[PDB]
Structures are given as structure tokens and as C-alpha cells.
Amino acid sequence: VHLTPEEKSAVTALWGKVNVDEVGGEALGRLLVVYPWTQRFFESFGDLSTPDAVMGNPKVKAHGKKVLGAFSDGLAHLDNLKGTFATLSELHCDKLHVDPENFRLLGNVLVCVLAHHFGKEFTPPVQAAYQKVVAGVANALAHKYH
Amino acid sequence: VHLTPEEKSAVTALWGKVNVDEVGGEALGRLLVVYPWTQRFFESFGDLSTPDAVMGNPKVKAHGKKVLGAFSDGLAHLDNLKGTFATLSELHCDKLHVDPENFRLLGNVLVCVLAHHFGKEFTPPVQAAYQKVVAGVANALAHKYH
Amino acid sequence: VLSPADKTNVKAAWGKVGAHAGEYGAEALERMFLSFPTTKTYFPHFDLSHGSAQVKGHGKKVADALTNAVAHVDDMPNALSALSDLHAHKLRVDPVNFKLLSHCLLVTLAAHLPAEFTPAVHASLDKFLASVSTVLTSKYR
Amino acid sequence: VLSPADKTNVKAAWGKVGAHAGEYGAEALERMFLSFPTTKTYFPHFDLSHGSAQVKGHGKKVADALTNAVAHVDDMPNALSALSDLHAHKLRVDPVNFKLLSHCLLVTLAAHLPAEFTPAVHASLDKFLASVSTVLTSKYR
Numbered sequence: 001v002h003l004t005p006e007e008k009s010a011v012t013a014l015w016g017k018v019n020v021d022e023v024g025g026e027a028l029g030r031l032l033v034v035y036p037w038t039q040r041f042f043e044s045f046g047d048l049s050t051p052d053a054v055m056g057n058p059k060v061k062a063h064g065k066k067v068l069g070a071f072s073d074g075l076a077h078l079d080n081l082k083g084t085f086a087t088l089s090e091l092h093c094d095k096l097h098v099d100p101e102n103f104r105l106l107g108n109v110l111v112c113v114l115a116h117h118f119g120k121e122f123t124p125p126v127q128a129a130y131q132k133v134v135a136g137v138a139n140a141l142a143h144k145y146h
Numbered sequence: 147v148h149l150t151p152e153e154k155s156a157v158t159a160l161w162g163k164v165n166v167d168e169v170g171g172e173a174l175g176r177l178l179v180v181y182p183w184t185q186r187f188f189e190s191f192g193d194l195s196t197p198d199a200v201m202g203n204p205k206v207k208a209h210g211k212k213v214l215g216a217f218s219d220g221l222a223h224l225d226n227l228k229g230t231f232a233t234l235s236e237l238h239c240d241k242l243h244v245d246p247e248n249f250r251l252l253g254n255v256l257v258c259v260l261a262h263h264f265g266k267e268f269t270p271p272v273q274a275a276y277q278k279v280v281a282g283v284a285n286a287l288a289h290k291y292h
Numbered sequence: 293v294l295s296p297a298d299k300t301n302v303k304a305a306w307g308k309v310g311a312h313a314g315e316y317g318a319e320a321l322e323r324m325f326l327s328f329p330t331t332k333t334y335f336p337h338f339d340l341s342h343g344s345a346q347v348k349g350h351g352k353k354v355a356d357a358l359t360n361a362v363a364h365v366d367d368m369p370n371a372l373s374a375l376s377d378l379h380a381h382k383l384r385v386d387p388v389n390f391k392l393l394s395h396c397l398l399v400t401l402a403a404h405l406p407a408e409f410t411p412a413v414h415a416s417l418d419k420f421l422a423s424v425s426t427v428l429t430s431k432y433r
Numbered sequence: 434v435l436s437p438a439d440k441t442n443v444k445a446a447w448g449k450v451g452a453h454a455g456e457y458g459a460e461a462l463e464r465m466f467l468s469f470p471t472t473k474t475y476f477p478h479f480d481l482s483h484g485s486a487q488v489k490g491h492g493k494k495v496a497d498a499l500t501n502a503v504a505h506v507d508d509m510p511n512a513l514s515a516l517s518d519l520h521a522h523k524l525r526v527d528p529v530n531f532k533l534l535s536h537c538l539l540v541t542l543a544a545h546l547p548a549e550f551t552p553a554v555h556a557s558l559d560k561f562l563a564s565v566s567t568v569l570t571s572k573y574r
């Protein structure tokens with residue numbers, strides 16, 4: 001999306017400190033706990049009963065790395081998000097049947113996870129920039145839905 | 147906004163039979179009756195306590211006529227809604243202080259009014275083409291909001 | 293938050309629907325699928341084309357459940373308890389899609405009942421559908 | 434709806450807030466104005482620069498209103514009665530803006546409560562802020 005040069009440097013600076021596999025499994029974990037109906041796609045994963053079983057589920061961690069890895073590689077192409085995620089958008093629509101609203105819930109959860117891991121370094125201007133990106137990513141992935 | 151040859155033809159055809167003065171008066175009135183909190187922007191319009199009073203308000207009728215008239219002028223420029231409504235967008239933001247969500251509520255009420263007036267003529271495909279138009283006009287007006 | 297006037301407007305308008313409820317149900321669904329393509333993700337096993345009997349059968353089930361609510365407007369939580377559990381623990385439809393269906397349901401009524409769809413009745417129906425949607429998502433978490 | 438376990442969690446987390454309630458409420462507003470600029474349309478009569486007395490003063494009232502809600506979680510409609518009348522008949526804020534403020538509150542609590550912001554507490558707080566919003570907008574029509 002349209003981020004000023006300083007906003008992009010802000011986004012890139014903080015992400016370099018992120019453990020992609022850790023945050024990935026933590027963002028998807030809280031997505032399934034806070035918004036339980038998102039579990040409709042993960043019935044084949046196993047025990048999703050309690051918050052503890054979901055956070056400690058290995059299959060939930062496995063997918064979380066896969067999702068956050070695609071997101072991570074996406075930041076290298078912020079000036080062309082629709083072009084980068086054009087294929088994933090088709091797949092999530094015609095084969096996975098994932099309601100795009102799921103992308104907006106995860107983006108918000110990802111922002112809360114970043115506030116938790118970084119604390120006071122996740123200042124208001126920094127949050128402002130990351131919101132535009134979780135929204136830009138969510139829009140690109142929902143672009144090919146028909 | 148992007149419309150298929152059949153959609154563009156449907157929207158143009160039906161809009162030729164529309165009496166902008168009467169349809170706009172019906173649309174603004176129903177917005178104030180169904181979603182009463184939108185009445186905050188028109189404290190200087192008079193009696194808005196009851197439904198018959200809102201619909202019979204001459205100031206409500208006159209304003210709906212200007213709004214739909216401006217909407218009408220944008221229909222001739224579906225290829226560049228952002229550039230056409232740029233001035234109005236900046237006005238509703240800097241001087242009017244209108245929350246952009248109101249543009250979306252009006253767009254849906256207008257769809258309910260076109261359905262009421264035309265009956266069977268407003269078929270599902272026609273409505274699908276009109277939801278696309280009102281969503282695009284609402285985004286073009288909420289574009290310069292900083 | 294449904295006042296006596298609202299309840300009267302609802303019974304009056306839904307009473308005039310009667311036997312055509314099933315046809316109106318299927319039309320509302322058809323309008324939603326075309327106008328809001330995302331909602332199609334919840335019906336990948338259906339033949340979502342015009343005139344589809346599957347959609348007509350579902351439209352009838354939705355319309356009857358609404359007829360059930362209008363008859364128990366003063367006790368909706370218990371009359372839809374079973375449906376609340378089904379959508380919350382099995383179907384798992386994201387809450388935003390209920391507003392999309394409600395709108396399409398209003399558009400259908402307005403296109404079939406012109407004289408009955410006054411700006412006051414319009415107000416009552418919208419509040420009624422929002423209350424139906426609150427009960428259907430009340431047990432999501 | 435709020436379960437007994439949810440209530441215990443919200444009271445535990447809010448108990449840790451304590452004195453810093455007013456300061457956090459001010460930061461939650463600043464975060465909202467920057468991320469979602471359309472909310473500024475409800476504050477034209479406020480100086481929205483960093484650390485202005487008006488935003489700090491409003492932040493404290495919003496914090497006090499939340500504290501009373503937690504102290505009366507078993508009966509929020511009677512506790513938030515006057516405030517709901519105020520947002521319904523005068524302020525008339527579109528309901529969509531209540532979600533933007535709740536999100537910004539969660540981000541703030543998450544950035545200041547490293548030990549208490551567990552997944553189970555994150556959930557209960559999101560439900561609690563959903564309930565407060567519903568009660569504040571229950572008299573809109």
C-alpha cells in the first residue's frame with residue numbers, strides 16, 4: 001500500500017527482530033482461541049478443545065509458520081501486493097473456500113501479538129503503519145474472490 | 147469500478163427511468179428513519195421526530211435531490227470515480243465532518259428504494275451491478291479522508 | 293429493543309407474506325450469492341446456479357425458521373436455541389454474513405410488497421432481522 | 434455472553450491496571466486517531482495533538498466508565514444506563530467505531546501487560562469490550 005519512506009523503514013526495522021516461526025504459531029493459535037469459529041477449517045488437526053491444547057498443538061504451529069512465512073516474504077514487495085498474492089487468492093477462493101473476513105481477524109491478532117512481544121517499542125505510529133499493511137495484505141488475498 | 151458489458155448496460159438502462167428528484171427524497175428520508183443516529187448532521191432541518199414528519203420535510207426533500215444529482219453525475223464517469231468526487235470527498239471530510247460509514251448506509255437504502263419502485267424489474271443480476279456501483283461511490287468519497 | 297409498534301409491523305408484513313415465504317427465501321439467497329460472492333464459500337457442495345432446487349430447498353428452511361421467530365417474537369432465544377447451536381458449533385458462519393443476508397431479505401420484500409413496505413415497517417423489519425442475527429450468533433464463544 | 438471464567442479473567446487483568454487506567458485510556462485514543470483517521474470526525478472540537486489535556490481528560494473518563502463496568506459486570510445495563518442514553522440520543526456515534534476503539538484498547542493492554550495477556554485473557558477481554566459496546570448502542574433505535 002501507500003506508506004511513506006519512514007513508515008516502510010519502521011515496518012522493516014521491527015520485523016528483522018521477529019522470530020517468524022514463533023510469532024506465526026502464536027498468531028494462528030490466538031486466532032483459533034479468541035475467534036473459535038475459525039477452527040472450521042482445521043478439524044483434521046486434532047485436539048482443539050482448550051486454549052492450552054490449541055497453543056501446544058503441533059499441527060497448528062506447522063501451519064502458522066507456513067502462513068507467516070508467506071506474509072514475511074510479502075514485505076519485500078509492498079509496492080506490488082496484488083501481484084505477489086494473486087495465486088494464493090485463487091487457491092483460498094476456489095479450493096479452500098476461506099471467507100476473506102478470516103484474513104482481517106488474523107491481521108488484527110497479528111498486531112496484538114506484536115504489541116505483546118515488543119511492548120513500548122510498538123509505538124502508536126508504528127501500529128498505524130502495520131495496520132495499513134495487514135489491511136493491504138488482506139485486500140490482495142481477497143482480490144480474486146468471485 | 148469494473149462492470150461487464152451486460153452490467154454496465156443494466157445500470158444505465160434502469161437509471162434512465164429514474165426521477166432523481168423523487169428517488170433522492172425517498173432515500174435520504176429512509177436513512178433518517180431506519181438509522182436515526184444519522185440525524186446528527188441535520189439539526190437545522192426542522193421536525194424529524196416521526197416518520198411522516200421526516201418524509202414530509204421539504205428540507206429533507208431538497209437535500210436528497212442535490213445528493214442524488216451528484217451521484218447521477220458520477221454515473222457518467224464509472225471509469226474514474228476517485229478523480230470525479232475528489233473535491234466532494236475533501237469537503238465532507240474537512241468541513242462537514244461526516245463519518246464515511248454513512249455513505250455505505252445510504253448506498254444500501256438506495257438499493258432498497260430502487261427495488262421498491264421497480265418491483266420485478268430489479269432482478270438479482272441488476273441488484274448485483276448496483277451494489278458494485280454504490281460500494282465504489284462510497285469509497286471514492288471516503289478517499290481523501292486523512 | 294422491539295417496541296409494541298415494531299412487533300405489530302412485523303406480524304402485519306410477515307402475515308401478508310404467508311405461503312410465498314419459501315419463494316422469497318430462495319430469492320434472497322440468490323440475490324446474496326450474486327451481489328456478495330464471498331458468501332459462496334459456505335456452500336461449496338451446492339449447485340449455485342439459477343433455479344437450483346438445492347437453493348430453493350434451503351430458501352424454504354430459512355423462511356420457515358423466520359416464520360417460527362415471528363410467532364415467538366417475545367421468546368426468540370428458546371425458539372431458535374437449536375439453530376444457534378448448529379451455526380455456532382458446526383456451520384461456523386462468520387457473523388458479518390448475517391447482515392448481508394438480512395439486507396437481501398429486505399430487498400426481496402420491497403420488490404414483492406410495495407404498498408406494505410412503508411418507511412416505518414422498513415425500520416421494524418431491519419431491527420427484527422438484527423435481533424434474529426444476534427440470537428443466531430449468541431453462542432459463538 | 435460472559436461466562437463466570439471470563440469475569441474472573443477481566444477482573445484479574447483490570448486489577449493489574451489499577452492507577453494507570455487513565456493513562457492507558459489516553460494512549461488507546463491516540464492509537465485510534467492515527468490508525469483509523471475516520472474517527473477524528475467525532476472530535477472536531479478537540480485539539481488532537483500529542484498529550485493535549487482534552488485527550489488526557491477524555492481518556493480518564495473512558496477508563497472510569499470501564500472500571501465501573503467491571504465492578505458491575507453482572508449488571509452492566511443499569512451501570513451504563515446514563516452513558517448509553519448519552520451515546521444514543523446526543524453523541525450518536527456509528528456502531529462501527531466501537532470496534533476500532535476496542536481493538537486499540539487491546540493493543541494498549543497487550544503492550545503494557547506482558548505477564549497477564551495470555552490467550553485465555555485476550556479472549557475474555559475481547560468479549561468484555563464487545564459487551565460494553567452492545568450495551569452502549571442498545572438504545573440507538
Ligand code: HEM
Nearest residue numbers: 038041066067068070071088091096098102103106137141
Ligand atoms: C495473511 C494471510 C494468509 C496467508 C499469507 C496464507 C498463506 C497460505 C499458504 C502459503 C498456504 C499453502 C498453500 C499451498 O501449499 O499451496 C495456505 C494454506 C491454507 N490456508 Fe492460508 N493464508 C493466510 C491466511 C489464512 C487464514 C486466516 C486461514 C483460516 C482461518 C487460512 C487457511 C488455509 C488452509 C486451510 C490452508 C491449507 C492447509 C494445508 O492444506 O496444509 N489461511 N495459506
Ligand code: HEM
Nearest residue numbers: 184187188212213214216217234242244248249252283287
Ligand atoms: C452518495 C453520497 C453523497 C453525495 C454524492 C453527496 C453530495 C453532496 C453535495 C453535492 C452537497 C452540497 C454542498 C453544498 O451545497 O454546500 C452535499 C452537502 C452535504 N452533505 Fe453530502 N453527499 C453524499 C452523502 C451524504 C450523506 C449520506 C450525508 C449524511 C448522513 C451527507 C451530508 C451532507 C451535509 C450535512 C451537507 C450540508 C447540508 C447543509 O449545509 O445544510 N452527504 N453533499
Ligand code: HEM
Nearest residue numbers: 331334335350353354357358375383385389390393424428
Ligand atoms: C436470517 C438468518 C439465518 C437463518 C434463519 C438460517 C437458518 C438456517 C436453517 C433453518 C438451516 C437448516 C437446519 C437443518 O439442517 O435442519 C440452516 C443451515 C445452514 N445455514 Fe443458516 N441461517 C441464517 C443465516 C445463515 C448465513 C448468513 C449463512 C451463510 C452465509 C448460513 C449458512 C448455512 C449453511 C451452510 C447451512 C447448511 C446447508 C446444508 O448443506 O444443508 N446461514 N440455516
Ligand code: HEM
Nearest residue numbers: 472475476491494495498499516524526530531534565569
Ligand atoms: C469503550 C467504549 C466507550 C466508552 C466506555 C465511552 C465513554 C464515554 C464517556 C465516559 C464519555 C463522557 C461523558 C460525560 O461527560 O459524562 C463519553 C463521551 C464521548 N464519547 Fe464515548 N465512549 C466509548 C466509545 C466511543 C467511541 C468509539 C467514540 C467515537 C469515536 C466516542 C465518542 C465520544 C464523544 C464525541 C464524546 C464527547 C467528548 C467531549 O465532548 O468531551 N465514544 N464517552
